[PDB]
Amino acid sequence: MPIYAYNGHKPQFADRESNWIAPDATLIGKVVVGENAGFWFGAVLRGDNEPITIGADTNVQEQTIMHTDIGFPLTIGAGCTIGHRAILHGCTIGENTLIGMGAIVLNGAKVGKNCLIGAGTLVKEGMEIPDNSLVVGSPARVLRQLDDAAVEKLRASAKHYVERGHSFMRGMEPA
Amino acid sequence: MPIYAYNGHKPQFADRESNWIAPDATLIGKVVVGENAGFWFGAVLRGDNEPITIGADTNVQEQTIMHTDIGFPLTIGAGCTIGHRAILHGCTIGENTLIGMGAIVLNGAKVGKNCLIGAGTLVKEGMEIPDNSLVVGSPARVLRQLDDAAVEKLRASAKHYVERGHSFMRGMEPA
Amino acid sequence: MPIYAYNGHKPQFADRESNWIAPDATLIGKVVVGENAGFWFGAVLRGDNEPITIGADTNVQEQTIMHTDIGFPLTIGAGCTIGHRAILHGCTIGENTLIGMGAIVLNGAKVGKNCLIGAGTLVKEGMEIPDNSLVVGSPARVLRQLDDAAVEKLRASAKHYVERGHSFMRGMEPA
Ligand SMILES: [Zn+2]
Ligand SMILES: [Zn+2]
Ligand SMILES: [Zn+2]
């Protein structure tokens, strides 16, 4: 497994035996990993400037890129869903938020909790997004606030993905 | 090597010995692969929900991601060109169609045959695209219909990729 | 090490061992590599049609894809910064230019020197971008010219990535 140390710092796991990590996944340097977090195929977390902090119950899907610039730590609240091929750079993400596949969130951006950032959306540098927002577009705009039911599908997402992580540790075999 | 089985299902080949599969390309679970289909570097097809069915002569270029949600099997017609780094999620795509590099096709979307989806395009959920269409933008727009010359350059494209695929099984060696 | 030769052609390094190459990076066929150029995790350069020329002191970040169609060589000026997950296809890029993360540059495009192409930008086929330009959007628009302070941050960026590359050769170890 490509878990790498850089400049003396290595990924620290709150509970490593609970983390799903695909063979393709790469965690490097200052990465802080919560409980039940899963990192799927081709993901890259380069914790070489500011540290990258992954909350618990958080899924990081295929080929997500996370990185930082000095002055911009990257923090993800708990039970978040990071869609296939998202890019997160030097931003902070509230708990129970979904980042749609292929979406890009840039330095200094602040996404609230219980948010849905739609697929392909670009959240520009320093953009701030209120809790419970549904965000789509390029440029990104707040469409409306999410109902309490939508906010539940977010928690549901995090839970299914934790379980799915577990099942891959147990039930994925070469063929 | 990275062909994986998950929960009893493994990738099924109509004629394996004809399929180009780059060494880091990753096939997982319920994946049905036609003949002469080629899968290039870093691609990932995760068939852990609904099955992923890849028609014959279809090329899946670099770091393409394919996945499904329950209720949305992913089916790709034959002789298709899946551009570098596309994302296909739970959708259906007609034969002789080109999906441009960096494009995103979401759940329930239905793309006809003989279509050109331009690079960076986002085809939203459940969107239907008539046959012979040219589609560009984010959000996607049907721009016009293709002349017979375009539709044939699509056919050329799949034909050229099959040749290049086979050539890679033979003429790719380490330096 | 996935450095590959194809059809008799091999990657040529002006000064190998000055080049940072992540274990995940993939170089194929007609690729010409400058000095101090760095290739990070998951990158792919497929030079099987026209040749791919990487200017010196130029960084190629995570999972960048570079490719060509016949008639469209891909050439990168010196000291360029190619952002996370960019796609470059058969284009030419001036020295000291930044191609933002997730940006797409298509065949025959010509990007000037000292340019800043923002994240998520789509530079369509044959688009020409004057020197010292700031470019953002999809479709891309030329916004204004950069002041000398901005142009300096471009030079600075390329310089840090050279050091950081070398530092990864020394200070990256498993676990
Ligand atoms: Zn970065
Ligand atoms: Zn998915
Ligand atoms: Zn190509």
Long-range contacts at A88-92 (CB < 8 A, ≥ 24 apart): A88/A64, A89/A65, A89/C84, A89/C101, A90/A50, A91/A123
The span from the CA of A59 to the CA of A97, in Å, is 11
The span from the CA of A63 to the CA of A87, in Å, is 9
Spatial neighbors of B35 by CB under 8 A, at least 6 apart, are B14, B15, B18, B19, B56, B57
Dihedral sign (CA B97, A86, A114, A118): negative
CA-nearest of B140, B138, B133 to B98 is B133
Amino acid identity at A76: I
Spatial neighbors of A170 by CB under 8 A, at least 6 apart, are none
How many domains are there within chain C?
Answer: 1
Strands A74-76 and A92-93: parallel
A6–C172 CB contact, under 8 Å: yes
Distance from CA of A149 to the nearest CA of C (A): 31
Please say whether the beta carbons of A29 and A7 come within 8 A: yes
Cis peptide before B139 (omega within 30 of 0): yes
Burial class (CB in 10 A: 0-12, 13-18, 19+), C72: buried
CA-nearest of A125, B26, B70, B114 to C101 is A125
Neighbours of C39 (CB within 10 A): 28
Please say whether the beta carbons of C87 and C70 come within 8 A: no
Neighbours of C167 (CB within 10 A): 15
Amino acid identity at A104: I
C85–A87 CB contact, under 8 Å: yes
- Is C67 annotated for ligand binding? yes
B3–A175 CB contact, under 8 Å: yes
Residue C157, SS3? helix
Spatial neighbors of B14 by CB under 8 A, at least 6 apart, are B32, B33, B34, B35, B56
The span from the CA of A41 to the CA of A2, in Å, is 11
Domain that residue B80 falls in = 1-175
Which residue carries 């760095």 as its tokens? C38
The span from the CA of A54 to the CA of A13, in Å, is 10
Model resolution, angstroms: 2.7
Residue B33, SS3? strand
The span from the CA of C158 to the CA of C85, in Å, is 17
The span from the CA of B122 to the CA of C29, in Å, is 32
B4 closest CB neighbour out of A40, A101, A174:
A174
Which CATH number is A84's domain given? 2.160.10.10
- φ, ψ (nearest 5 deg) of residue A152: -75, -35
Please say whether the beta carbons of C76 and C59 come within 8 A: no
Distance from CA of A42 to the nearest CA of B (A): 8
Question: How many alpha carbons lie under 13 Å from residue C88 in its C-beta half-sphere?
Answer: 35
Neighbours of A109 (CB within 10 A): 23
Residue C70 DSSP class: T
- Is B89 annotated for ligand binding? yes
Please say whether the beta carbons of A174 and A168 come within 8 A: no
C5–B120 CB contact, under 8 Å: no
B164–C48 CB contact, under 8 Å: yes
Among all residues of chain C, which has the CA nearest to that of B172? Answer: C6
Method used to obtain the model: X-ray
- Measured from the alpha carbon of residue A85, the closest ligand is 2
The H-assigned helical ranges of chain B are: 148-171
Please say whether the beta carbons of B104 and B121 come within 8 A: yes
SS3 content of chain B, % helix, strand, coil (to 5): 15, 40, 45
In this complex, which chains have at least 3 CB pairs below 8 Å with chain A? Answer: B, C
B85 closest CB neighbour out of C3, C46, C87:
C87
- Is A89 annotated for ligand binding? yes
Burial class (CB in 10 A: 0-12, 13-18, 19+), A63: buried
Residue B105, SS3? strand
Please say whether the beta carbons of A104 and A123 come within 8 A: yes
How far apart are the CA of B26 and the centre of ligand 3, in A? 20
Q: What is the dihedral of CA A129, A133, A134, A136, to 10 degrees?
A: -20
Q: What is the dihedral of CA A1, C84, C81, C24, to 10 degrees?
A: 30
The span from the CA of A82 to the CA of A99, in Å, is 5
